[model samples]
Target: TPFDALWQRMLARGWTPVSESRLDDWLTQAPDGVVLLSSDPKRTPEVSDNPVMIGELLHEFPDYTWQVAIADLEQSEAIGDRFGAFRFPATLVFTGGNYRGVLNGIHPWAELINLMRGLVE
Candidate 1:
């Protein structure tokens, strides 16, 4: 499954795999970070490349001390609903121990870059 593969690859890239219930703990622990509110790629195949894309996105902004984590499938919708990240694959950016914004769903390469640049700024 792409979800499992994404989980493994994300870990290899130093991304912690966290259950939705524990997500706040991760947020509080590392206030400035990126949280991937991920979903099963079976329904949204575009999410398959998210693991790699997130890595590259982080690389683009080397100035920020970014922590990375992938939210597990447990009660996925609950988190998504709260965060307005109803999209299958959402990238949540945090800074100063606060949530900045969410990059919802798969977007064009340039659009993602632009969105992230705005979010972090």
Candidate 2:
């Protein structure tokens, strides 16, 4: 990858003025593409899946610039709704502030890679 940066936004709230401002900044900055991960820790049987999936993304698709962020369904319910996310493992895809598609569930590394590749391609 040309750039090595993972933005893990651990926030107390996402609808607040401060968090909303940060959201605006991220949206404007991530013009190429981004993946918004929405999940609940309690429901997530494998808590490490999300991070390991990121490793897969970073390794397989290093050439493309991308971003990944997490939103807790319990803490950020409104924010998740704002992004049209309501699943345990929903991943919303966006590019240039325009929504493209979404993905859900736990997939094998290769299938997951193929599905995600279509998000920004």
Candidate 3:
């Protein structure tokens, strides 16, 4: 149920998951630009992506940096509080420790790209 929920959330937000192997490779390539966050039943509402989809997206857009944080329900909630997230499936963008923007809920691919573009600019 948790994976299903997270999968649906990722689809809605135009985000995919990254495999452990791929993630490892990605970290070697650009550690600072990317992050990988994981969530479980306890963190039902915490936002996360499907590994395959995330890997593909990262491969497609090599210019942007990504980050991942794995959290259980409690951890996710803690993170939400830390980041001021009131919604599930929230995608917050940051730069130099400053918040740039967020992509919450489901979004189209183009929209996601647009969001990323805005972050870079």
Q: Estimate TM-scores for all models.
A: 0.88, 0.64, 0.52
Q: Any runs in candidate 1 off by more than 4 Å, and if so which? A: none
Q: Tens-digit lDDT track for model 3 on 1-121? A: 7666655655554443444335445445434343334456355533344344444544555554555433344544555566676665554455444456554555666666676677656
- CA lDDT of every candidate: 0.80, 0.54, 0.50
The clash numbers for all candidates, in the given order, read 0, 0, 25
As a whole number from 0 to 100, the lDDT of residue 117 in candidate 1 is 85
**Lowest summed lDDT over 10 consecutive residues: which window, candidate 2?**
1-10
Q: Once model 1 is optimally superposed onto the true structure by TM-score, how far is the C-alpha of residue 75 displaced, in angstroms?
A: 4.3
How do these models rank on TM-score, best leading?
1, 2, 3
Q: After superposition, how far is residue 34 of candidate 2 from its true place, in Å?
A: 3.0
Could you tell me which residue pairs clash in candidate 1? none
